[PDB]
Amino acid sequence: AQNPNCNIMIFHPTKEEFNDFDKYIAYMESQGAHRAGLAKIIPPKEWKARETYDNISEILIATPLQQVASGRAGVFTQYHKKKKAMTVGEYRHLANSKKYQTPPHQNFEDLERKYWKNRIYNSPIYGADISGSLFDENTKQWNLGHLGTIQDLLEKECGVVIEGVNTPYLYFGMWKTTFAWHTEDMDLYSINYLHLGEPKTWYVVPPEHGQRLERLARELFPGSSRGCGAFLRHKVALISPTVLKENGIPFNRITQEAGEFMVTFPYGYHAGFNHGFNCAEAINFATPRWIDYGKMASQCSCGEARVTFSMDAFVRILQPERYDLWKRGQD
Ligand SMILES: O=C(O)CNC(=O)C(=O)O
Ligand SMILES: [Mg+2]
Numbered sequence: 001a002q003n004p005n006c007n008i009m010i011f012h013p014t015k016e017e018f019n020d021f022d023k024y025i026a027y028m029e030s031q032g033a034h035r036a037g038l039a040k041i042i043p044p045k046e047w048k049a050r051e052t053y054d055n056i057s058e059i060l061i062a063t064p065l066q067q068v069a070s071g072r073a074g075v076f077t078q079y080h081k082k083k084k085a086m087t088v089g090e091y092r093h094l095a096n097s098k099k100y101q102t103p104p105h106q107n108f109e110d111l112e113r114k115y116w117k118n119r120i121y122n123s124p125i126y127g128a129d130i131s132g133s134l135f136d137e138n139t140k141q142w143n144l145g146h147l148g149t150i151q152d153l154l155e156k157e158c159g160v161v162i163e164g165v166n167t168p169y170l171y172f173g174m175w176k177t178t179f180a181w182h183t184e185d186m187d188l189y190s191i192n193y194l195h196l197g198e199p200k201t202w203y204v205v206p207p208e209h210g211q212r213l214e215r216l217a218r219e220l221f222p223g224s225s226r227g228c229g230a231f232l233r234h235k236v237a238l239i240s241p242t243v244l245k246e247n248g249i250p251f252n253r254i255t256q257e258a259g260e261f262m263v264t265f266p267y268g269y270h271a272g273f274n275h276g277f278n279c280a281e282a283i284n285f286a287t288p289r290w291i292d293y294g295k296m297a298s299q300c301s302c303g304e305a306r307v308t309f310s311m312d313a314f315v316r317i318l319q320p321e322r323y324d325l326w327k328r329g330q331d
């Protein structure tokens, strides 16, 4: 068995190996990369996502989200308070202001210590989930707006044609902006490219151990757990590496820098934080190996998780017994 300790693997494809996206995912899996839940892919030196980032300031963040925390430093929830619209140029200035800027630090480990000590005492503002792309249309390799769609993959594997579309999303971050513990919708893969700016630190639980994280979360968030049998689908709960280690939960960590891709694998729980002003692009995707995870994915039916149009068909075809209850949650 490849990668039996479930370590995060880092890949350096050549320009030839960067041509065929599906083939390279399958290669990484042949080496055991999925067992970690997360892999890093460093593009060949010949590649670029676009020519420059000099002309992005007029992109609109229609609904910036202020991430307000409740709880204790290592075990907290966050809720998202909607703020007034602002441009990317306005958001960048805000991120760099004395109230929000990254503090002085020695290295990534010192900054990680400061994040976990102090996150809950501040409310950073995140531009998340903005439909769009920063890849140049002429970039033919690993262009996250030109991937094979999940609807086409389901059709190719199972023979059933379905409605829905699959497009990328932009994230504009600042120091302390936070992504809560989650797996993807329908336990899909995700791919994330850090276009510019400061790093993103990730934490991940191997898919084979995801139910250990879920049992800890039910213990640590007992009201939320009574409310919903899949409350991590709400994407609000944070648990620190120190708390995970105290409770024996297997995990790994890695820092993504500008110019790097991360892939999350089906049922790989992940969480993390941004170091300072940055911009990332991410999308979900599927492979043949995903289908069995899609059929078994938990679902939120309490009303909180509310998701895209395109999840309807995935539930309807892969999980027909759950469909009626899930759809009630959507309505
Ligand atoms: O970058 C972020 O805020 C969160 N991203 C992801 O969870 C991802 O790419 O799967
Ligand atoms: Mg612009």
Ligand code: NI
Pocket (backbone or CB within 6 Å): 182, 183, 184, 190, 264, 270
């Ligand atoms: Ni994710």
Ligand SMILES: [Zn+2]
Pocket (backbone or CB within 6 Å): 227, 228, 229, 230, 231, 233, 234, 300, 301, 302, 303, 304, 305
């Ligand atoms: Zn729920």
